[PDB]
Design a protein around this ligand. Structure first.
Ligand SMILES: [Ca+2]
Ligand SMILES: [Ca+2]
Ligand SMILES: [Ca+2]
Ligand SMILES: [Ca+2]
Ligand SMILES: [Ca+2]
Ligand SMILES: [Ca+2]
Ligand SMILES: [Ca+2]
Ligand SMILES: [Ca+2]
Ligand SMILES: [Fe+3]
Ligand SMILES: [Fe+3]
Ligand SMILES: [Fe+3]
Ligand SMILES: [Fe+3]
Ligand SMILES: [Fe+3]
Ligand SMILES: [Fe+3]
Ligand SMILES: [Fe+3]
Ligand SMILES: [Fe+3]
Ligand SMILES: [Fe+3]
Ligand SMILES: [Fe+3]
Ligand SMILES: [Fe+3]
Ligand SMILES: [Fe+3]
Ligand SMILES: [Fe+3]
Ligand SMILES: [Fe+3]
Ligand SMILES: [Fe+3]
Ligand SMILES: [Fe+3]
Ligand SMILES: [Fe+3]
Ligand SMILES: [Fe+3]
Lengths: 172, 172, 172, 172, 172, 172
């Protein structure tokens, strides 16, 4: 047992390790989406930048969980990072809809992590989740909802003009 | 024979002279396209700037081949610069499609030049082509593909609104 | 077939996709090594920074291959990123030795990629590999060899004083 | 007929198109002369710069005529650019003498263009020629005459010392 | 065998060691030429500076090959540096002609080195030669040809006025 | 006989020529030592810098003797530069000990040169040696003695920790 470990339940340590893999997976999903929009037959360069930025942020989220695991005296155990669900993401609106779905799934896992930390009376882990993850997830979900709404209202995905102008005026 | 000539095959010298004429021709094609978009009944001023810039670049490419010919001790032999295929380039999308076609033909000629230099064991000429021409061609072709894709998706060429907005937001 | 594809063999496209996964894996290995040295019972903070930097570089290498795949008109196909071989990397010297081994394996795969591009007469892909990958690999391998040599000569891994001072004076 | 066309005779439009080709040809002649002096067995680097600058200026003159053609509502029709008369220009003095001859021929064509515009009562085209072309031609011819005179008086072309010092002290 | 050595043939290692000695020899030749022009009965101070600069560059070329030898895990083996062919270099034109001859011999050895690296499928060594040596040699040979041409045309070596003015206006 | 020669004995001229070769040899020895410490299995980067700097200084010393030879109206006669005694210099302490030995041998030759100039009543050559060489040699020998002393006292060469820390704290 680690000389620094205090009030850190084995279930919490394992759930943090599962959260680490989920953030790496989400980073990988966003990376896949980014270079889809870099294709010569898709060619939405700000969609590609937007998702690449989201990819780097998710990987930063994963590294902060790895730091937290070591701060509390747990041990990081890494798993395979699963390849994303699709190779072809269809359209800008479809990608935005899949990102919304992904962020709500990450949010669900974070809420279950908070429930477990509360059940194990770990207020430091509760505050860690609240300070660095919960409002970031709410903000991301609201922003992705806004984007989906505007794209639908503009006439995406049938209107290629809509996705072109959204890429210019909202993501540029 | 020139006091500087070394490991420079007569076939290479002749192929460089053919490449010089092809770059001048491509410069001329882009010049023709540029002032088509300067017509009062076409009036896409950023299409005109885009192709004028491409015209000057191609002529710079030709001058660097002329410098290389003299660097290796060959002798420049110039030919007529053929007038371009069309006087009327139809639309922004059609011009972009003809430029893509032209750049792939220039790229094909450069690859045959690289094959010949490899067959004649001229590593200096091989590296010259690779450093200054091959990735520039790949970048140009990818960018022209992107442009063609966006214009088609926007509804060009029937939509004059699409070509107007592309001129503003991508080429401006 | 992509409007930009030219002189890009199907075998090359597939090998680039394999190289993309290998660089992501190496990024993951370095990430694992980094947070090993962040453990409270290891506590070599510059070893941790060194490997975290290597992790980010490898992921940049992967993204440049993804950009190249799209530049040539191939299609990125992603695979699972395998979890690294070890969870516990033993010591600073052992980690450096595993990194040396990993970089030589990445280098071997890059050389086989160059052989294939030469066999398919793809000079653009040959120069891409040479310009961005081959000398970077040689430099990394030489630097990791230097580090392994100094650590061994200092008396690592039995001397914890050696790894402490190496962390301060070479990696700090 | 173009919505902007006014007081622009069909003969003027055709003569402008002929002037456009003559300026492109003169640009090509100067380009050929420039890289002659870049040869390792000629090696007069300021002669080469002088003629390269003249080459770029002539091409700017051609582009301003293309702009004028569109400003008046005519239609540009391009022709082949004929390869220059010589491949080998003999000496610095001989090149200067051929440039003088070429500029006087361009000047003659411009004066016939002015006569035609006067005969067709096109004062805008008359002033265009006078403002941008006539005094530029007179200045170029006077400067080329000066150069020919100094080179002859110095003992060119038999004196290679004369052409060396002229390149240094007048063109450098 | 070195822990860093990979894909580095014994023949390549030996040829690099021969190239190292050839660059040191050329550095020595240029050093000898430099101080010839520093003699009170020769007294061409810019000829002396020009060749001293070339001497330092060649020694930098030798040191970069020594660095490359260690980067690839070969072992440097040094040989005597032979004294140059002449003690008395006759005239500025004669020295320039001997330098041209020397640079073409160095270039020949570099091309044979590139052939060997290609025959041993060492793309890293091929690119090393191309990036740092081949175009530098072509540039040096072209510049020395230019100098020889101007000196001959000026009337060197019988005209001591020509070598005086070349020293002032080209090398000063 | 040179128009500038005055009070310059033939024996002095010959001894200066021998001193020129000895300084070039010492420059070569230091160059060899430098890249020994650049080896991946030695890897003392400040030892390598220290000896490379000493290499450049010795070559500057040789060039100042060549300038002096011409200043006095003697004639430089160059000899082969002998390859250094060892290819493998064993350790940092062994290299420092060989450098000390080499500098004392160079110093001995300089003192014999001063004796000869005194015997030939050449006060200008006596002062040249004293101003530029004698105290530089004494300083170099004292500094190399200091280094040898510290390395021995630290436990070099058996202690690889000592050579590592000396490289960091004294030569870095
Ligand atoms: Ca799967
Ligand atoms: Ca025709
Ligand atoms: Ca596994
Ligand atoms: Ca290359
Ligand atoms: Ca003809
Ligand atoms: Ca007027
Ligand atoms: Ca000899
Ligand atoms: Ca010997
Ligand atoms: Fe997240
Ligand atoms: Fe899987
Ligand atoms: Fe998020
Ligand atoms: Fe081009
Ligand atoms: Fe024709
Ligand atoms: Fe191009
Ligand atoms: Fe990598
Ligand atoms: Fe697995
Ligand atoms: Fe690497
Ligand atoms: Fe003109
Ligand atoms: Fe013709
Ligand atoms: Fe003019
Ligand atoms: Fe060299
Ligand atoms: Fe000898
Ligand atoms: Fe050189
Ligand atoms: Fe010395
Ligand atoms: Fe010997
Ligand atoms: Fe010294």
């Amino acid at each position: 047992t680690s000389q620094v470990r205090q009030n850190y339940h084995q279930d919490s340590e394992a759930a943090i390790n599962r959260q680490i893999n989920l953030e790496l997976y989400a980073s990988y999903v966003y990376l896949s989406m980014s270079y889809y929009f870099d294709r010569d037959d898709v060619a939405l360069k700000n969609f590609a930048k937007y998702f690449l930025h989201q990819s780097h942020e998710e990987r930063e989220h994963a590294e902060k969980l790895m730091k937290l695991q070591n701060q509390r005296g747990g041990r990081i155990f890494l798993q395979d990072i699963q390849k994303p669900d699709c190779d072809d993401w269809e359209s800008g609106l479809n990608a935005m809809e899949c990102a919304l779905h992904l962020e709500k799934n990450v949010n669900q896992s974070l809420l279950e992590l908070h429930k477990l930390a509360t059940d194990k009376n770990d207020p430091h882990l509760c505050d860690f989740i609240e300070t660095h993850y919960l409002n970031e997830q709410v903000k991301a979900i609201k922003e992705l909802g806004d984007h989906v709404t505007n794209l639908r209202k503009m006439g995406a995905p049938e209107s290629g003009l809509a996705e072109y102008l959204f890429d210019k005026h909202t993501l540029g």
